[PDB]
Structures are given as C-alpha cells and as structure tokens.
C-alpha cells in the first residue's frame, strides 16, 4: 500500500544520505533517482536502479527513456509513483525532486503496469 523500496532496506540511512549529498554536490544539474518495480507489478525488469536524470526532463520524457529500457510488450502499460501518487507528465524531474525527494537526497519512483500502486 505504501511505497516500500528494497534499496532502502539494503543500505542504511547514514550511508544513503552521504551518497546523495555527494552525488548532488558532484552532478548538480542532474537529480539522483532510484527506480524499482512496485509490488504485484506484472511487467519487465530494470537492470540498474540508479539513474542520474537531467533536471529539465519532464516526467513524460522520463516515462519514455524508461519504457525503452524495459521495453513494454503488447498492451503493457507503464505508470510511475512517488509517495503513492502518479506524477503529472507535465512536471519536470527537477520539480519532482524538489517536491518529493527523500531526505537521503534521492528521489524514489516505483513503476507498475497498473495505475494503482501495489495492485
């Protein structure tokens, strides 16, 4: 029901906040994004979970660079989730990060083939 990530359970909070502070201090024009498949999601997998994405890209454009990485089969859908909410495709990644970043300085996005998280 609520955004549960494996990356948060694999690495402690001192460690993440320190990596996030550094990666923000190193690649300022990009925002660090952790991307994981939501529970119960019937859909392809991502090799990597860690992505530095430019601040100026919209969510729409992101749905699309990811759609390529997973390659959706016929009548698969692809939805995003940040804090249990589908991000408007009009928003940018910089605004999404500003508005939704966890305090380890990472932005967390779950993806699913369903429009409701964990369904």
């Amino acid at each position: 029901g609520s955004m549960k990530f494996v990356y948060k359970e694999e690495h402690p909070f001192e460690k993440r906040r320190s990596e996030g502070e550094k990666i923000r201090k190193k690649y300022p024009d990009r925002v660090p994004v952790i991307v994981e498949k939501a529970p119960k999601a019937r859909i392809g997998d991502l090799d990597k979970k860690k992505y530095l994405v430019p601040s100026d890209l919209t969510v729409g454009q992101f749905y699309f660079l990811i759609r390529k990485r997973i390659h959706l089969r016929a009548e698969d859908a692809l939805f995003f989730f940040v804090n249990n909410v589908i991000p408007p495709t009009s928003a940018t990644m910089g605004q999404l990060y500003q508005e939704h970043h966890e305090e380890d300085f990472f932005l967390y996005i779950a993806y699913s083939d369903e429009s409701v998280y964990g369904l």
């Binding site: 990666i23 990009r30 990597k48 860690k50 992505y51 530095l52 994405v53 430019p54 660079l65 990811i66």
Partner: peptide
C-alpha cells in the same frame, strides 16, 4: 554505479 539517462 550510477547510470546517466540520457548519457
């Protein structure tokens, strides 16, 4: 470790 998107 981090993948740049787009590179």
């Amino acid at each position: 470790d981090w993948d740049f998107l787009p590179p």
